[PDB]
Design a protein around this ligand. Structure first.
Ligand SMILES: *[C@@H]1O[C@H](CO)[C@@H](O[C@@H]2O[C@H](CO)[C@@H](O)[C@H](O)[C@H]2NC(C)=O)[C@H](O)[C@H]1NC(C)=O
Ligand SMILES: *[C@@H]1O[C@H](CO)[C@@H](O[C@@H]2O[C@H](CO)[C@@H](O)[C@H](O)[C@H]2NC(C)=O)[C@H](O)[C@H]1NC(C)=O
Ligand SMILES: *[C@@H]1O[C@H](CO)[C@@H](O[C@@H]2O[C@H](CO)[C@@H](O)[C@H](O)[C@H]2NC(C)=O)[C@H](O)[C@H]1NC(C)=O
Ligand SMILES: *[C@@H]1O[C@H](CO)[C@@H](O[C@@H]2O[C@H](CO)[C@@H](O)[C@H](O)[C@H]2NC(C)=O)[C@H](O)[C@H]1NC(C)=O
Ligand SMILES: CCCCCCCC/C=C\CCCCCCCC(=O)O
Ligand SMILES: *[C@@H]1O[C@H](CO)[C@@H](O)[C@H](O)[C@H]1NC(C)=O
Ligand SMILES: *[C@@H]1O[C@H](CO)[C@@H](O)[C@H](O)[C@H]1NC(C)=O
Lengths: 196, 240, 49
């Protein structure tokens, strides 16, 4: 289940996109779960996202009453009340608009230049998968000891035809010992038994 | 156009669902998760008698909701999920307007009494306005029935499990055992604390009833068949 | 206004205060912030001796 989360932040905050971080980004804008499986990719985009006179399209939340939950997005824009005095929708003393704009200028220091971040989230080896790496497939060899790779699940064993019937949302089957003992062939949807 | 207009029952071992998508046979698997406590008190609401009763209050959504509905004429049409249910924050709309299944995560200005209308479908009085919409997910166009759903909101995913079962019954929740199957995981990424059911009125309520129970962190012992199906479970905190 | 030289570094005692570091969110931006023996997400819930 490949998902691509994308955004632009300051360069000094790229460290904050990681499991278990704290800071203005990890607290108020974008939080990753602790048991995160996936990849984080970032790169400086100063020549794209910064223009002379500042680029003020990119915003971030500065104030929030509580920390975000993992993968939660908050786009509310209601006045943050920083004191006991109430804010009735008007910015004032102890009343702040919660979003502030990055000031991205081409001559900002490397810590203040825009960085484009992409977080890829996915799960591995538990369900049918439709995105795969560039590896060529071979013909199926049965009744012989082979090293196999079925949809990313590598191993060693003898392949034999199977009587099991998987529901359409299932791809692997496991034992009491939790080892994979049945698989569905990706090219031909036929169940095969894996025997040591 | 936004026009204007408690009972309790037992949960006889209901609301169990498949925790993963791995095929298993002939095994007893113990699991710790959010489940409906066996033999707990659900709340009962109905809509009946041309109008006498039309129950669609705003209920809390604590950690997850078990929702069951015994109906014969498709009165329950979907739900609204949110935290403030107004246009200040984002909300989730799941609705079946007799032709499509619409799943929207927008900024809705909901009506105080949202419903749909049948005269043929005639009205969609749910929300005054939709803005800043982030997610959409539709389908192809288009008491006798018990329809059970489990809604969970974990790690930015809205998980829905469902099971439709033919019944033949007069009053209450059928005492039985049925395992709910995974329906969909939506990457909506919003904060959900309250929810409200969407009913369709006739222009009169009709006749339908639904029950709402709340999940809690429980330990269950699930029994897997020689096929993949779940056939029984144990609630370790029910009794000694 | 002034920090010390690394060879003669400054030590300051901190006591009787609430470490609400979200007050730094408005003004400060840190390239490095690494904690040892403690997790960053737990700092809001502790009293330091
Ligand atoms: C999800 O929404 C609820 C309701 O708006 C938030 O709960 C409130 O939290 C604020 C800040 O702590 C309090 O001032 C309110 O009194 C709370 N209301 C209720 C009904 O609990 C909750 O914080 C939100 N979730 C997250 C992760 O921010
Ligand atoms: C039920 O809701 C769906 C979802 O919007 C409606 O479908 C669309 O209708 C709008 C306006 O009529 C069109 O612009 C879209 O192109 C339609 N899309 C699809 C996929 O159908 C549908 O018309 C509604 N039906 C009723 C009876 O209210
Ligand atoms: C959310 O809605 C607000 C208000 O409807 C949007 O802010 C408007 O966007 C338009 C076009 O981008 C601008 O012309 C306005 O100046 C903006 N402000 C207002 C008060 O209208 C905002 O773009 C929407 N999107 C998000 C992600 O918040
Ligand atoms: C488990 O799966 C099997 C395989 O589909 C189901 O099959 C029954 O198989 C027996 C033996 O061949 C037949 O006599 C029955 O007529 C089959 N029933 C159906 C509905 O096809 C079986 O029902 C499933 N459940 C159990 C408990 O075995
Ligand atoms: C004036 C010094 C007070 C120090 C009190 C000790 C408590 C230490 C815990 C947190 C304080 C460290 C500040 C971290 C700044 C935020 C991290 C970030 O921007 O991502
Ligand atoms: C329904 O009642 C609410 C009060 O809860 C009110 O705000 C609203 O105006 C009423 N509906 C109409 C159509 O006036
Ligand atoms: C439900 O509520 C009733 C009345 O308070 C109580 O007797 C019962 O023990 C509760 N739990 C069950 C069994 O649903």
């Amino acid at each position: 289940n490949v998902y691509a989360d994308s955004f632009v932040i300051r360069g000094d905050e790229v460290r904050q996109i990681a499991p278990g971080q704290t800071g203005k980004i990890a607290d108020y804008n974008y939080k990753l779960p602790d048991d995160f499986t996936g990849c984080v990719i970032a790169w400086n985009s100063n020549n794209l996202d910064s223009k002379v006179g500042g680029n003020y399209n990119y915003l971030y939340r500065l104030f929030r009453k509580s920390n975000l939950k993992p993968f939660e997005r908050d786009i509310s824009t209601e006045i943050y009340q920083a004191g006991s005095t109430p804010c009735n929708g008007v910015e004032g003393f102890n009343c702040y608009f919660p979003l502030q704009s990055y000031g991205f200028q081409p001559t900002n220091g490397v810590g203040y230049q825009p960085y484009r971040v992409v977080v890829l989230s996915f799960e591995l080896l538990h369900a049918p998968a439709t995105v795969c790496g560039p590896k060529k497939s071979t013909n199926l060899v049965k009744n012989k000891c082979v090293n196999f790779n079925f949809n990313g699940l590598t191993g060693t064993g003898v392949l034999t035809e199977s009587n099991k019937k998987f529901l359409p949302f299932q791809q692997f089957g496991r034992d009491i010992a939790d080892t994979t003992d049945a698989v569905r062939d990706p090219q031909t949807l036929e169940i095969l038994d894996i025997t040591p | 156009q936004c026009v204007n207009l408690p009972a309790y029952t037992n949960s006889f071992t209901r609301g169990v669902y498949y925790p993963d998508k791995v095929f298993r046979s002939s095994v007893l698997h113990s699991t710790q998760d959010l489940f409906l406590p066996f033999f707990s008190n659900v709340t009962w609401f109905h809509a009946i008698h041309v109008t006498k009763r039309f129950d669609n209050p705003v209920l809390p959504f604590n950690d997850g909701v078990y929702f069951a509905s015994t109906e014969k004429s498709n009165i329950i049409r979907g739900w609204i999920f949110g935290t403030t249910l107004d246009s200040k924050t984002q909300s989730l709309l799941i609705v079946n307007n007799a032709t499509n299944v619409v799943i929207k995560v927008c900024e809705f200005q909901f009506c105080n009494d949202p419903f749909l209308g049948v005269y043929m479908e005639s009205e969609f009085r749910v929300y005054s306005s939709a803005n800043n919409c982030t997610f959409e997910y539709v389908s192809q166009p288009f008491f006798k029935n018990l329809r059970e759903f489990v809604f969970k909101n974990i790690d930015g995913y809205f998980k829905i499990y469902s099971k439709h079962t033919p019944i033949n019954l007069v009053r209450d929740l059928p005492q039985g055992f049925s395992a709910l199957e995974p329906l969909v995981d939506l990457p909506i990424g919003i904060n959900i604390t309250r929810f409200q059911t969407l009913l369709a009125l006739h222009r009169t309520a009709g006749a339908a009833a639904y029950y709402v129970g709340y999940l809690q962190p429980r330990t269950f012992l699930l029994k897997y068949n020689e096929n993949g199906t779940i056939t029984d479970a144990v609630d370790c905190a029910l009794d000694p | 206004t002034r920090f010390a030289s690394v060879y003669a570094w400054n030590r300051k005692r901190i006591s009787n205060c609430v470490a609400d570091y979200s007050v730094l969110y408005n003004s400060a931006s840190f390239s490095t912030f690494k904690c040892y023996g403690v997790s960053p997400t737990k700092l809001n819930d502790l009293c330091f001796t």
